[PDB]
Amino acid sequence: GSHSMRYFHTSVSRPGRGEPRFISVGYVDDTQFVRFDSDAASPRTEPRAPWIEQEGPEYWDRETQISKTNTQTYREDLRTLLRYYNQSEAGSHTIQRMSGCDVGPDGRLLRGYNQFAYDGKDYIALNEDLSSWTAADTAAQITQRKWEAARVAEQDRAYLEGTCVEWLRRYLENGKETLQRADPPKTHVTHHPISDHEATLRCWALGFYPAEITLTWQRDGEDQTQDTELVETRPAGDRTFQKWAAVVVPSGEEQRYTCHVQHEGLPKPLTLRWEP
Amino acid sequence: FEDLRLLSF
Amino acid sequence: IQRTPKIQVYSRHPAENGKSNFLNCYVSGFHPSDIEVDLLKNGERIEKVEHSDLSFSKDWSFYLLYYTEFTPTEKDEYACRVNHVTLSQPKIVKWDRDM
């Protein structure tokens, strides 16, 4: 189906404790495949998935230099935002970036991204047109004016329409065994009495890839969104993900509840119930 | 593959 | 302003007494990224726990997976202990086989 490539950058200042640490990690869909950490004893771009290991020395050398220079750029940016937001040298601050592209089944560009945050809040983002910017505030507008003057968006567009899609296509082919395999959820419902009058029904989904999934409870065929406890989808550590959804039901009314599961790996949505 | 940052803030 | 971590403690595979597994602590939705996570066995810290590389979600909040090999028994109790700037005191979440 459709696929994504994403690079996630995190730079964090630590006044009194050296220079800001830089981390870059790369993903295809929900699979991480590269990392770089400036705090590593010997910082280097390193493989984190089997299908990227075949990339030659030039790949690792270039990406390492790129992350080394990026480390310095984010340190400059952290100093800059202290000025733009009139902040002291005392506090720790964070810059984040998300960059990448989505492609469809045929590998054509669906859209590109280049967006930044400061201390967890939107700072500046490339719009979907890949030609204009959204600045969150008057500080980010200073960056926007600077980036407009230098025609940064044009260069972003070039990367996103070329390099980004080209390499995503390559990774998808080289990792087709895993990147192009959906693992459906293994499902079951558990039942736990809470008291003489109430019981918990918990609907489980395990071992699925990718992470996107829909898990819902219905009572007499009606969605129980408000009364459902839904945990965040979580990694199992073996590439797969897990999720559950729980409802508190009146004792004796268990069979009026149905769990519904949708996932890319399922030909048709699943309906399941408590089965004693 | 990721490229250099294009320009500082 | 800051965001406190959501915390989940769980096993990679369904828990099966006497059988090798992985004990996971997933922390997510937090900001800033600095966070302290221990895995506990009967109240004591497990040594050499590993974790995933720092990444974040669409809303910029961070997530990390901490994990270690373990063989569950009926008597052994496991938990995760988390500290973060948003927390005045470390938060302990106990491992529960059906959560």
Residue numbers in the entry:
A (entry chain A): 1 to 276
B (entry chain C): 1 to 9
C (entry chain B): 1 to 99
Q: What does the report in the manuscript say about this coordinate set?
A:
Our previous work identified NP338 as an immunodominant CD8+ T cell epitope in individuals expressing HLA-B3739. Our conservation analysis of the NP338 viral peptides across vaccine and circulating IAV strains, including pH1N1, H5N1, and H7N9, found 16 natural variants of NP338 peptide, with the most common mutations occurring at position (P) 5, 6, and 7 of the peptide. To understand the molecular basis of cross-reactive TCRαβ recognition, we solved the structure of NP338 and its variants bound to the HLA-B37 molecule, as well as the structure of a cross-reactive TCR in complex with HLA-B37-NP338. Thus our data demonstrate that CD8+ T cell cross-reactivity in the context of NP338 peptide and its variants is favored by similar conformations adopted by the epitopes.
Two major variants; FEDLRVSSF (NP338-L7S) and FEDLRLLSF (NP338-V6L) were dominant in H1N1, pH1N1, H5N1, and H7N9 or H3N2 strains, respectively, representing 93–100% of the distinct strains and were thus selected in addition to the previously published (WT) peptide for further analysis. To understand the molecular basis of HLA-B37-NP338+CD8+ T cell cross-reactivity, we solved the structures of two major NP338 variants, namely, NP338-V6L and NP338-L7S in complex with HLA-B37. Superimposition of the HLA-B37-NP338 binding cleft with either HLA-B37-NP338-V6L or HLA-B37-NP338-L7S revealed a similar conformation of the HLA-binding cleft (r.m.s.d. of 0.08 Å). In addition, the peptides adopted a similar conformation as the NP338 peptide with an r.m.s.d. of 0.12 and 0.09 Å, respectively. The hydrophobic P6-Val residue sits near the α2-helix and interacts with Val152, Gln155, and Asp156 of the HLA. The substitution of P6-Val for P6-Leu in the H3N2 was readily accommodated in the HLA-B37 cleft and did not change either the peptide or HLA conformation. Overall, the two major variants of the NP338 epitope adopted the same conformation as the NP338 epitope and represent molecular mimics of the WT peptide, which might favor T cell cross-reactivity. Interestingly, the EM2 TCR affinity was increased by four-fold for the NP338-V6L (Kd ~ 30 µM) compared to NP338 when bound to HLA-B37. In a similar fashion, an overlay of the HLA-B37-NP338-V6L with the EM2 TCR-HLA-B37-NP338 structures shows that the larger side chain of the P7-Leu might create additional contact with the CDR3β loop and might in turn provide a basis for the improved affinity observed for the EM2 TCR towards the HLA-B37-NP338-V6L (Kd ~ 30 µM).
